[PDB]
Amino acid sequence: LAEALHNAL
Numbered sequence: 727l728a729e730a731l732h733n734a735l
């Protein structure tokens with residue numbers, strides 16, 4: 727989750 731969101735943002 728943490729990384730998915732970093733990338734998304």
Ligand SMILES: [Co+2]
Pocket residue numbers: 732
């Ligand atoms: Co970064």
